[PDB]
Design a protein around this ligand. Structure first.
Ligand SMILES: [Mg+2]
Ligand SMILES: [Mg+2]
Ligand SMILES: [Mg+2]
Ligand SMILES: [Mg+2]
Ligand SMILES: [Mg+2]
Ligand SMILES: [Mg+2]
Ligand SMILES: [Mg+2]
Ligand SMILES: [Mg+2]
Ligand SMILES: [Mg+2]
Ligand SMILES: [Mg+2]
Ligand SMILES: [Mg+2]
Ligand SMILES: [Mg+2]
Ligand SMILES: [Mg+2]
Ligand SMILES: [Mg+2]
Ligand SMILES: [Mg+2]
Ligand SMILES: [Mg+2]
Ligand SMILES: [Mg+2]
Ligand SMILES: [Mg+2]
Ligand SMILES: [Mg+2]
Ligand SMILES: [Mg+2]
Ligand SMILES: [Mg+2]
Ligand SMILES: [Mg+2]
Ligand SMILES: [Mg+2]
Ligand SMILES: [Mg+2]
Ligand SMILES: [Mg+2]
Ligand SMILES: [Mg+2]
Ligand SMILES: [Mg+2]
Ligand SMILES: [Mg+2]
Ligand SMILES: [Mg+2]
Ligand SMILES: [Mg+2]
Ligand SMILES: [Mg+2]
Ligand SMILES: [Mg+2]
Ligand SMILES: [Mg+2]
Ligand SMILES: [Mg+2]
Ligand SMILES: [Mg+2]
Ligand SMILES: [Mg+2]
Ligand SMILES: [Mg+2]
Ligand SMILES: [Mg+2]
Ligand SMILES: [Mg+2]
Ligand SMILES: [Mg+2]
Ligand SMILES: [Mg+2]
Ligand SMILES: [Mg+2]
Ligand SMILES: [Mg+2]
Ligand SMILES: [Mg+2]
Lengths: 116, 101, 70, 87
RNA sequence: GUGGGAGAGGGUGGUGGAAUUCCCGGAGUAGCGGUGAAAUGCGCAGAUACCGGGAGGAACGCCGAUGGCGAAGGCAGCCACCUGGUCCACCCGUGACGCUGAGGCGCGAAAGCGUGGGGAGCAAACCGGAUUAGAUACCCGGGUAGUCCACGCCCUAAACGAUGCGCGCUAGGUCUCUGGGUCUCCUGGGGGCCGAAGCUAACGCGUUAAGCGCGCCGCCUGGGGAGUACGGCCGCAAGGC
């Protein structure tokens, strides 16, 4: 209903899930998918397959609003962080660029014992 | 008296009425704190490395002065008062350490 | 690879204001390069660290950048 | 701090003769000037315990030179003390 | 003394960006989260993911090191003021003024205590979910004291180099920080590694001694009872010597 046809794709990849958002050039989102959006429920969502199908689910949802050009942004290390990218390139969406923007603190906040 | 270097970055949207006022304000503040000015370098519009005050550029000033040391931090306090003044960084002058000489 | 001090001129290591030359010591991200990549001495790198941090606060050198790859 | 302008003013005031930089009186003068610099710095900054250690070392060395002057020539000791207002 | 030098040494004020959390707005559906699997938890009052604006607190990525500084505890963004220690060159001055050090006094991580602040993240106790034969636990979701600041207490430690301090002497080689020099190198002052002589029960130490000597302090004399009992001093208490 928008006809954006150019914009950004954010891959949020953790060890428990891989989830993909697609926005317009200004950053405001359009559609999105994830490991849970497709049928997967538990630990399966943080798999490269779920990463693939999630990237492709949002990539077809963006075809509705007419997306062709896509700028990829990646945050987090995760299984299928790369597999969601590789899926995104073959989605028909012409991938403009790929950037890794994973936030790293300058040692500011005390992590949970899990990360200690 | 020791010798310092004053760095002042202000908002790069001023017309002349405000640019003169802002700098003749920096003169007035220096006078009251006893800063003899040895030399000045006015660079002006420079592309900043990151957004400062939502503005992608900044107007650059540099002064080399000699003043009493006890008064320096109250001079920093007096320059950052101005809304248009964004960065005040005052460094004690050092010898130009060369490398690959 | 080549080292930074090797392909350069005679410069002021203490000048926080010269961006054209200080940009040559940053990586693709804003990170300050190790001595193995700058070819500097123990005393020089310590001084460079401080001068780059000075330039970062004046908005001349970046704190961190975005890597365009992967 | 203590500039060499003020240093020389003291060394010339307490020298036993022109050119003397190391007399006991001159050392005890120069230590005492640093003592009074530090104890006024320590009236404020009470929580600075590392500078306080430097002071305990100066008093030890200042009282070690005075304990020496007392033994050899007790006159120059009083004329030094009465001139520095100590003890 | 003079003239130079390096440094997260200390105290005070100021300040910068990254990240977490919360609030506001924009946009946007059906889950997010989390684990070995999970569940409690959160989500249609619209979360997670994304863009922007704001508040607040704590810690400083890269530089960063086998590195530097300090007597030890310990010290890491940047700027300025106050300030301590230390090292080198000159061979200038005093003329044994030295060393150690029972007492005394000062310092003393973390935790804990008092009064008043502060409170983002983390997190004893605790509230739950799991696992389990049981779970008073590791794993998961929550969360108070506290961690942070001011002032005053507490005085412990694997407070470690398990090696008290100062000085003289006794092959070198090699890496390194930092001075000076006639700058393949020489010469100081630190920090590492091999190793002469020698010591050691052995492992190992070896110009940074655990070697050869001297001065002075501390301390030891089988394990359990026991750092307990009593007494004393100290502490608001926990408790300490
Ligand atoms: Mg999962
Ligand atoms: Mg993380
Ligand atoms: Mg990590
Ligand atoms: Mg990791
Ligand atoms: Mg860790
Ligand atoms: Mg301002
Ligand atoms: Mg000096
Ligand atoms: Mg410091
Ligand atoms: Mg909202
Ligand atoms: Mg519910
Ligand atoms: Mg708040
Ligand atoms: Mg490191
Ligand atoms: Mg040391
Ligand atoms: Mg230690
Ligand atoms: Mg100094
Ligand atoms: Mg002589
Ligand atoms: Mg003589
Ligand atoms: Mg004692
Ligand atoms: Mg303590
Ligand atoms: Mg504590
Ligand atoms: Mg308290
Ligand atoms: Mg928590
Ligand atoms: Mg917990
Ligand atoms: Mg069992
Ligand atoms: Mg033993
Ligand atoms: Mg012991
Ligand atoms: Mg050696
Ligand atoms: Mg040299
Ligand atoms: Mg050595
Ligand atoms: Mg042998
Ligand atoms: Mg050895
Ligand atoms: Mg020798
Ligand atoms: Mg020895
Ligand atoms: Mg005993
Ligand atoms: Mg037994
Ligand atoms: Mg017995
Ligand atoms: Mg037994
Ligand atoms: Mg026992
Ligand atoms: Mg006990
Ligand atoms: Mg008894
Ligand atoms: Mg008792
Ligand atoms: Mg009592
Ligand atoms: Mg108890
Ligand atoms: Mg106890």
């Amino acid at each position: 209903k928008r006809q954006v046809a150019s914009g950004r794709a954010y891959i949020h990849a953790s060890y428990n899930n891989t989830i993909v958002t697609i926005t317009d050039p200004d950053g405001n989102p359009i559609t999105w998918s994830s490991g849970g959006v497709i049928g997967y429920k538990g630990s399966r969502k943080g798999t490269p397959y779920a990463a693939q199908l999630a990237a492709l689910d949002a990539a077809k949802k963006a075809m509705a609003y007419g997306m062709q050009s896509v700028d990829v942004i990646v945050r987090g290390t995760g299984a299928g962080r790369e597999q969601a990218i590789r899926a995104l390139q073959a989605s028909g969406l012409q991938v403009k660029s790929i950037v890794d923007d994973t936030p790293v603190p300058h040692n500011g906040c005390r992590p949970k014992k899990k990360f200690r | 008296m020791r010798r310092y270097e004053v760095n002042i970055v202000l908002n790069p949207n001023l017309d002349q009425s405000q640019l003169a006022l802002e700098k003749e304000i920096i003169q007035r503040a220096l006078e009251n704190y006893g800063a003899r000015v040895e030399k000045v370098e006015e660079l002006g519009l420079r592309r900043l490395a990151y957004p400062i005050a939502k503005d992608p550029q900044g107007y650059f000033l540099w002064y080399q002065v000699e003043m009493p040391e006890d008064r320096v931090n109250d001079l920093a306090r007096e320059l950052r008062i101005r809304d248009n003044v964004r960065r005040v960084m005052v460094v004690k002058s050092q010898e130009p350490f060369l490398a690959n000489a | 690879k080549a080292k930074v001090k090797a392909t350069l001129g005679e410069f002021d290591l203490r000048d926080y204001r010269n961006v054209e030359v200080l940009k040559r010591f940053l990586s693709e991200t804003g990170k300050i390069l190790p001595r193995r990549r700058t070819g500097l001495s123990a005393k020089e790198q310590r001084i460079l660290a401080k001068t780059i941090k000075r330039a970062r606060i004046l908005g001349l050198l970046p704190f961190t950048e975005k890597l365009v790859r992967k | 701090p203590i500039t060499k302008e003020e240093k020389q003013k003291v060394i010339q005031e307490f020298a036993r003769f022109p050119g003397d930089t190391g007399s006991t009186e001159v050392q005890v003068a120069l230590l005492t000037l640093r003592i009074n610099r530090l104890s006024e710095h320590l009236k404020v900054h009470k929580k600075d315990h590392h500078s306080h250690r430097g002071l305990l070392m100066m008093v030890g060395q200042r009282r070690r030179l005075l304990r020496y002057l007392q033994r050899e020539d007790p006159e120059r000791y009083r004329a030094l003390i009465e001139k520095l207002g100590i003890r």
